[PDB]
Amino acid sequence: PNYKLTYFNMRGRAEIIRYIFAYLDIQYEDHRIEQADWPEIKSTLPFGKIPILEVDGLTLHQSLAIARYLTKNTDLAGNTEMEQCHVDAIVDTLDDFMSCFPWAEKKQDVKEQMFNELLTYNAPHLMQDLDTYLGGREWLIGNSVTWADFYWEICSTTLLVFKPDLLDNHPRLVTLRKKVQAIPAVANWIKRRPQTKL
Amino acid sequence: PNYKLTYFNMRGRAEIIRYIFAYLDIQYEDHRIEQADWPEIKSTLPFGKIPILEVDGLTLHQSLAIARYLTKNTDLAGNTEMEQCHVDAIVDTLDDFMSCFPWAEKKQDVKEQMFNELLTYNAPHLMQDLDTYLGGREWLIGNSVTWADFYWEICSTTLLVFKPDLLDNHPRLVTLRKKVQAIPAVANWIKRRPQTKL
Ligand SMILES: N[C@@H](CCC(=O)N[C@@H](CS)C(=O)NCC(=O)O)C(=O)O
Numbered sequence: 001p002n003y004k005l006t007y008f009n010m011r012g013r014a015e016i017i018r019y020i021f022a023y024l025d026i027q028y029e030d031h032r033i034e035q036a037d038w039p040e041i042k043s044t045l046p047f048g049k050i051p052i053l054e055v056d057g058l059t060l061h062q063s064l065a066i067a068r069y070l071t072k073n074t075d076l077a078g079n080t081e082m083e084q085c086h087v088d089a090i091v092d093t094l095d096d097f098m099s100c101f102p103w104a105e106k107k108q109d110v111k112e113q114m115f116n117e118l119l120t121y122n123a124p125h126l127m128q129d130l131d132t133y134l135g136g137r138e139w140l141i142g143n144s145v146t147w148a149d150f151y152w153e154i155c156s157t158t159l160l161v162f163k164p165d166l167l168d169n170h171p172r173l174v175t176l177r178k179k180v181q182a183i184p185a186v187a188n189w190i191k192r193r194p195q196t197k198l
Numbered sequence: 199p200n201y202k203l204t205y206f207n208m209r210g211r212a213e214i215i216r217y218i219f220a221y222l223d224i225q226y227e228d229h230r231i232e233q234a235d236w237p238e239i240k241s242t243l244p245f246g247k248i249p250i251l252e253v254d255g256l257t258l259h260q261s262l263a264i265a266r267y268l269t270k271n272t273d274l275a276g277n278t279e280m281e282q283c284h285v286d287a288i289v290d291t292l293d294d295f296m297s298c299f300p301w302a303e304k305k306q307d308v309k310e311q312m313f314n315e316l317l318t319y320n321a322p323h324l325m326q327d328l329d330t331y332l333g334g335r336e337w338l339i340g341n342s343v344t345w346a347d348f349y350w351e352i353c354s355t356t357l358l359v360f361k362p363d364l365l366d367n368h369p370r371l372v373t374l375r376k377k378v379q380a381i382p383a384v385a386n387w388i389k390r391r392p393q394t395k396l
Pocket residue numbers: 012013042048049050051061062063064290294
C-alpha cells in the first residue's frame with residue numbers, strides 16, 4: 001500500500017507509527033510540515049488534528065488507533081486477544097500520564113512548575129508501577145516484543161529529556177529501553193531520524 | 199468465563215463495558231464501590247485505577263482496552279481492518295475530550311469553571327466535527343452499529359447533563375443517540391440500570 005504519514009517535525013505522537021513501520025519493514029512517506037503549512041492542511045481534516053495517515057488515498061486519524069491498525073495480525077499486537085488487551089492497557093496507561101503534561105502552556109514559569117511537580121511526584125509513582133508490572137520479565141507483555149514496549153521507549157525518551165535521572169533507580173526499565181533500541185529495525189531508525197527535542 | 203466488573207456507582211468509564219456485556223448477552227457481576235472503600239482497593243491494584251475487569255484469575259484494567267477486548271471478533275467491531283481503525287479513532291476522539299474534564303477536582307469553584315469552559319468553548323466544535331463526519335449515514339462507522347456508536351451515546355448522555363442544549367443544532371446526532379437507545383439489549387439495560395447523575 002501507498003502510505004503517507006503527516007505530522008510536525010518531531011517525534012511526538014507520530015513516533016509510535018514510525019517505529020511500527022520500521023519494525024514491520026513497511027515503506028512510507030514521512031511528511032513533516034512546518035507551522036506555516038498547518039492552517040491550510042488543518043482545514044482539510046475532518047477532526048483537524050495530526051498525525052494522519054493516508055493509505056492509498058484514504059485518510060486515517062488518531063495516532064494510537066493507527067498504531068493498532070498497523071500491528072493487526074502481526075506479533076507486535078500481542079500473541080492472544082488477552083495479551084492484546086494487556087498491550088492496549090499499558091499503552092493507555094502511558095498515554096494517560098503523558099497527557100498530564102502542559103505541552104502547550106505559554107507561561108514558561110507555570111510550565112516549569114507543572115513539569116517539576118509531575119516529574120517529582122507522579123512520574124516516580126508510575127515508574128514503580130511499571131517496574132513491578134514488568135518484574136524480571138523480558139518484555140512488558142508475553143514473551144516477545146509488542147508495540148507497548150515501543151511506546152514505553154518512546155514515552156520514556158521524552159520524559160528523560162526533562163528528568164535525566166528518572167530511571168536511575170529502575171535498572172529493569174533502563175534494560176527494557178535498551179532492548180527496544182537494540183532491535184535492528186529500531187536501531188536503524190533511531191540513527192537516521194531527524195534529531196528534535198520532542 | 200466468570201466476569202466481575204469493579205467501578206464506582208456511576209455510569210462513568212465503566213458504562214461502555216456494561217453496554218457491551220448487555221449487547222453480547224454476557225452475564226457478569228456489576229460490582230459498585232463506595233468512595234470510602236476505594237483507597238483500600240486502589241492500594242492492591244497494579245496501576246491504581248478503575249474500572250477493572252476480573253476474568254478468571256486475572257485483573258484487566260483501562261476501560262477502552264477492556265472494551266476493545268470484549269468487542270474483538272464480534273459484530274460490534276468494524277467490518278474491515280480500516281473500519282476497525284475508524285471505530286478506534288472515533289472512540290479516541292470522544293475519549294480525548296471527556297478526559298479534559300477535571301472530574302476529581304476538589305475545589306468546586308475551579309471545577310465548575312473548567313467544566314463551563316470546556317462545555318461552552320470546546321464541546322460545540324466536537325459536535326460540529328462529529329455531525330459532518332456522520333453526514334447522512336446511519337451509524338458512525340460503516341453500515342451497522344459498532345461500539346463507537348455506544349461510546350458516542352454514553353459520552354453525549356453525560357455532556358447533556360451539564361449542557362442540555364448541546365445538540366439543539368444537531369438533529370442527526372440526536373437521531374443517532376435515539377437509534378442506539380432503541381437497540382433492544384441497550385434499551386433493556388438503560389431501563390434497568392442504577393439511575394445516577396454521572
Ligand atoms: N490523541 C490524538 C491527538 C491529536 C492531536 O491533538 N494532535 C495535535 C498535535 S500533537 C494537534 O493536531 N494540534 C494542533 C491543532 O489542534 O491545531 C492523537 O494521538 O492523534
